[PDB]
Write a protein that binds this ligand. Sequence first.
Ligand code: HEM
Ligand code: HEM
Ligand code: HEM
Ligand code: HEM
Ligand code: HEM
Ligand code: HEM
Lengths: 71, 71
Amino acid sequence: ADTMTFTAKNGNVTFDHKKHQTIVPDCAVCHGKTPGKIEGFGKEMAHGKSCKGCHEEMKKGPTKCGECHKK
Amino acid sequence: ADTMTFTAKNGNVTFDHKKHQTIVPDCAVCHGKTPGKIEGFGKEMAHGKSCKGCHEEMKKGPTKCGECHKK
Ligand code: HEM
Ligand code: HEM
Ligand code: HEM
Ligand code: HEM
Ligand code: HEM
Ligand code: HEM
């Protein structure tokens, strides 16, 4: 439906945008004031606040390498 | 499901893999013998035969930078 697959040499990472919208109901959490592309998105942001950091803080969702990176 | 994102400093590239699976004759066109991770995939391959080259040769699909790279 609205799943984004981010390529990574160590295993692609599948992100269900629609599901995340259903459970994080404020776009601004991920996008600030402009839902759309996230400037700079890549490894550093994904391993920080844009992906892994939320999972770590909320104790829900993937935090170990292999939970995201699927060979 | 629905799209792949190839992160790039000059604008991420969104790629409808399923659509390409449908219209492009055989997985081997992009994957060789077996579908799996495309070793080396990146700028050189994308600007060559893996992406842009097909679009140019077959006169269908994006060949201009901004048609693929979106900020
Ligand atoms: C210590 C554990 C991890 C290691 C060693 C690791 C390794 C890497 C590496 C090497 C890359 C760059 C890939 C490339 O440029 O081809 C990358 C990117 C990425 N990682 Fe991880 N990763 C880990 C944990 C995670 C986790 C837990 C997540 C999910 C929450 C994640 C999500 C991502 C995403 C989405 C990208 C790609 C951003 C883009 O598309 O450019 N990683 N990771
Ligand atoms: C209803 C609230 C939201 C709206 C309206 C929204 C909208 C969008 C839009 C328009 C895109 C661009 C798709 C494209 O490139 O064509 C996008 C991408 C994205 N969204 Fe959301 N989103 C929302 C909530 C969220 C949430 C809560 C998260 C984090 C959990 C999130 C994470 C992302 C990520 C990682 C991308 C890919 C960014 C990129 O490729 O640069 N979104 N979103
Ligand atoms: C692009 C960055 C992100 C990636 C790659 C990512 C990836 C994932 C994956 C693979 C799952 C498990 C599969 C699923 O249930 O859909 C998941 C679950 C989850 N994520 Fe993320 N996520 C990202 C960003 C975020 C952010 C920024 C937050 C919080 C603000 C968040 C909160 C959650 C939560 C609460 C779950 C648990 C879902 C459940 O238990 O049903 N994620 N995420
Ligand atoms: C002359 C026009 C173009 C320029 C100047 C350009 C520029 C670039 C640059 C600088 C990169 C490397 C990005 C990075 O390392 O962060 C890149 C990679 C890439 N470009 Fe282009 N590009 C052009 C045309 C195209 C077109 C037409 C397509 C689509 C058919 C395309 C698809 C890609 C893809 C898929 C990557 C690889 C991103 C990744 O590593 O995942 N480019 N391009
Ligand atoms: C039905 C035929 C196809 C199958 C079964 C298939 C399967 C796959 C699989 C399993 C992956 C993930 C590989 C990984 O672990 O990274 C993948 C990624 C990819 N495929 Fe396909 N594919 C097919 C057709 C195509 C076609 C026709 C193209 C080119 C037009 C293509 C281009 C790509 C690209 C660029 C990736 C991302 C890079 C990568 O992850 O290796 N695929 N495909
Ligand atoms: C990973 C490499 C490639 C990338 C990033 C890429 C990207 C795109 C994009 C952005 C479009 C326009 C949006 C869409 O119609 O889905 C497109 C269309 C198209 N691509 Fe590719 N492409 C790739 C590889 C290929 C290859 C190898 C072929 C031929 C073997 C091909 C054939 C086509 C065709 C025929 C269209 C036209 C679809 C239509 O008219 O509706 N593409 N591609």
